[PDB]
Amino acid sequence: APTAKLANGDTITGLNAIINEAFLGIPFAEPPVGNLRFKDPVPYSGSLNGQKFTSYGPSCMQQNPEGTFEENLGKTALDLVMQSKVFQAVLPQSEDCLTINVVRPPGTKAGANLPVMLWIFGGGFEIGSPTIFPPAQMVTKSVLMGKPIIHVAVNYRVASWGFLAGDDIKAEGSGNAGLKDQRLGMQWVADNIAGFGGDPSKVTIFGESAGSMSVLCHLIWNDGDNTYKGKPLFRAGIMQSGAMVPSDPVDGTYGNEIYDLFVSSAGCGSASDKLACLRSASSDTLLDATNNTPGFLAYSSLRLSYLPRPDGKNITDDMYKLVRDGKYASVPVIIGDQNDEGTVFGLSSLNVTTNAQARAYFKQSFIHASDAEIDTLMAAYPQDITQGSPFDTGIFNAITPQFKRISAVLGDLAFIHARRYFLNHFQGGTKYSFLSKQLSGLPIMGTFHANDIVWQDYLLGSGSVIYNNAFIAFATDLDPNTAGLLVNWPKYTSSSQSGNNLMMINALGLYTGKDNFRTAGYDALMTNPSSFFV
Numbered sequence: 061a062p063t064a065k066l067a068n069g070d071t072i073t074g075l076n077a078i079i080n081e082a083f084l085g086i087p088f089a090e091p092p093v094g095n096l097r098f099k100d101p102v103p104y105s106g107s108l109n110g111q112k113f114t115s116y117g118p119s120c121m122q123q124n125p126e127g128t129f130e131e132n133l134g135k136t137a138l139d140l141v142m143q144s145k146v147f148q149a150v151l152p153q154s155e156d157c158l159t160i161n162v163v164r165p166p167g168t169k170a171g172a173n174l175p176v177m178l179w180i181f182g183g184g185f186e187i188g189s190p191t192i193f194p195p196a197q198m199v200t201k202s203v204l205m206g207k208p209i210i211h212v213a214v215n216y217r218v219a220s221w222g223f224l225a226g227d228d229i230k231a232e233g234s235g236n237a238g239l240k241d242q243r244l245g246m247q248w249v250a251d252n253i254a255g256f257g258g259d260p261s262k263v264t265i266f267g268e269s270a271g272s273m274s275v276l277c278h279l280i281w282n283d284g285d286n287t288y289k290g291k292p293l294f295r296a297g298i299m300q301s302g303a304m305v306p307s308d309p310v311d312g313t314y315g316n317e318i319y320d321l322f323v324s325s326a327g328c329g330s331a332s333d334k335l336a337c338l339r340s341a342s343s344d345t346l347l348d349a350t351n352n353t354p355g356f357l358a359y360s361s362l363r364l365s366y367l368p369r370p371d372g373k374n375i376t377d378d379m380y381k382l383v384r385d386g387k388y389a390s391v392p393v394i395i396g397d398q399n400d401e402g403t404v405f406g407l408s409s410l411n412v413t414t415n416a417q418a419r420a421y422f423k424q425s426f427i428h429a430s431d432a433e434i435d436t437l438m439a440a441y442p443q444d445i446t447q448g449s450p451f452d453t454g455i456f457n458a459i460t461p462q463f464k465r466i467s468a469v470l471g472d473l474a475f476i477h478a479r480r481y482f483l484n485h486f487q488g489g490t491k492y493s494f495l496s497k498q499l500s501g502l503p504i505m506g507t508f509h510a511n512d513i514v515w516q517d518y519l520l521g522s523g524s525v526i527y528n529n530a531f532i533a534f535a536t537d538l539d540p541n542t543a544g545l546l547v548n549w550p551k552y553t554s555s556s557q558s559g560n561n562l563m564m565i566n567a568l569g570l571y572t573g574k575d576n577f578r579t580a581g582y583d584a585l586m587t588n589p590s591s592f593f594v
């Protein structure tokens with residue numbers, strides 16, 4: 061019964077879920093299969109008139125997080141689970157996965173002109189899909205606050221299929237395919253969303269983790285040109301854990317190293333035209349090859365095999381440099397973090413137990429860093445177990461003498477101080493920042509990376525007034541304060557400003573604070589960001 065009219069005039073039918081109306085599995089691009097593998101997506105051209113969209117399509121192919129070229133039980137066990145029929149029955153995957161999803165308040169009709177919140181899932185640029193991030197909580201809340209919004213989730217290619225790099229990809233101009241899928245989805249929204257009751261001039265893009273870093277990539281995309289048909293694609297962005305990607309270009313050292321290993325595992329090591337050889341390999345061969353390169357939970361940890369990289373075309377340069385140079389879209393922004401971002405990633409190196417070992421690991425991970433730089437970093441992030449993450453836990457959580465130390469560095473470099481760097485240089489619009497400590501006390505993990513997904517999509521907690529209410533107010537009014545919070549959210553200007561510039565969250569509620577913690581670490585990492593690029 062719920063129906064919507066697309067830009068071409070097609071009339072589609074959806075699912076009435078009582079609490080909302082969903083249109084799930086709408087294709088937005090041609091299947092990037094066979095000879096279209098690794099290439100920019102192609103707009104869908106067929107007709108959908110008369111078709112019904114009542115269920116989530118399959119996720120793009122997924123890389124085993126324990127994947128690696130070494131043989132280990134974690135990799136194997138994980139393969140057994142993902143490849144099992146029950147798992148494949150619950151969470152199906154396919155290379156034919158470029159679909160978009162629209163969920164709206166009950167009774168919405170075209171012409172409602174409601175703000176749109178476009179969700180970009182995260183998953184290490186290696187796993188994930190819109191299916192595991194239910195929008196009901198966000199949609200119900202916007203109705204209750206009398207500020208209804210339309211939730212749009214776009215699917216995009218992950219791992220090798222969406223982020224293969226190296227000299228061949230570069231030469232062909234096929235870099236950052238997965239970000240191009242997201243960019244096409246945004247154009248699909250600009251063209252079609254009105255028919256669903258949405259206002260295309262009121263789009264706020266938001267994502268968590270790799271999805272958050274994706275949001276930043278969209279601000280600096282095409283050197284800050286976010287227009288399509290002369291109009292902005294989005295008017296605001298929200299970043300939940302992640303800003304700049306600390307990465308070398310598509311044709312750099314590790315981009316080629318991973319590419320060579322992928323090609324060899326694919327059995328294309330002898331082809332003179334390896335891309336052509338990859339494009340005709342079976343789906344299982346490419347899957348096995350991908351799982352033979354390191355996954356995000358493997359020892360390599362955040363030194364990712366697949367991630368966005370400057371390609372000289374769409375991401376014209378070092379992302380830190382682009383933000384420093386003013387090459388971004390001029391939109392207001394909300395960016396925040398979870399107190400203990402690094403704890404899950406610190407679990408990947410529990411065999412690093414001595415200071416010498418920790419030094420070697422950092423050396424191995426940051427190939428452009430000098431001894432002197434590695435020295436300043438290890439001085440700024442001491443072995444002292446009270447200093448590490450989970451933060452403020454004293455002598456607790458010391459699985460090994462380096463765990464808390466390694467966790468602190470990874471979380472700061474990848475998420476926390478990267479956020480500070482962004483806020484100190486971004487002058488494109490009003491900035492608001494938050495820091496959550498909602499789970500202080502949770503053994504080992506603390507206020508871990510991605511716990512915000514639980515409070516935003518699954519359960520109500522103290523953080524939910526931020527993750528739902530505050531975000532919906534921002535999408536609607538460009539000010540999180542219209543949410544009617546008990547604590548005013550102060551604008552952020554710089555980390556060295558006078559008073560409180562951070563909205564904080566604890567188990568009891570909100571309070572404000574300052575973004576002035578671990579400044580030695582910030583200087584050790586952000587003085588010359590590129591020294592720590594992967």
Ligand SMILES: CCCCC/C=C\C/C=C\CCCCCCCC(=O)O[C@H]1CC[C@@]2(C)C(=CC[C@H]3[C@@H]4CC[C@H]([C@H](C)CCCC(C)C)[C@@]4(C)CC[C@@H]32)C1
Nearest residue numbers: 182183184188192269270306362363425474510513514518
């Ligand atoms: C030492 C090496 C060099 C150091 C590093 C240097 C540079 C770093 C460069 C890049 C870093 C980029 C990292 C990007 C992303 C990190 C990877 C990541 O895990 O994300 C995760 C981000 C969140 C995300 C999307 C992931 C997987 C599945 C998701 C879950 C499935 C289920 C669960 C629900 C909450 C379950 C319901 C629960 C109940 C109780 C109701 C979900 C949705 C929580 C959120 C999860 C991946």
Ligand SMILES: *[C@@H]1O[C@H](CO)[C@@H](O[C@@H]2O[C@H](CO)[C@@H](O)[C@H](O)[C@H]2NC(C)=O)[C@H](O)[C@H]1NC(C)=O
Nearest residue numbers: 128130354359360409411412413417418421424
């Ligand atoms: C911790 O374990 C990792 C993973 O097993 C070790 O790294 C591997 O070590 C073997 C043997 O030296 C090498 O063949 C692999 O190439 C390494 N893999 C990677 C991804 O680096 C690591 O040496 C161990 N760390 C310590 C301090 O002992």
Ligand SMILES: *[C@@H]1O[C@H](CO)[C@@H](O)[C@H](O)[C@H]1NC(C)=O
Nearest residue numbers: 240243244281282373374375
């Ligand atoms: C990427 O950059 C090229 C070169 O400027 C441009 O022609 C192309 O449209 C861009 N792609 C996207 C998806 O914006």
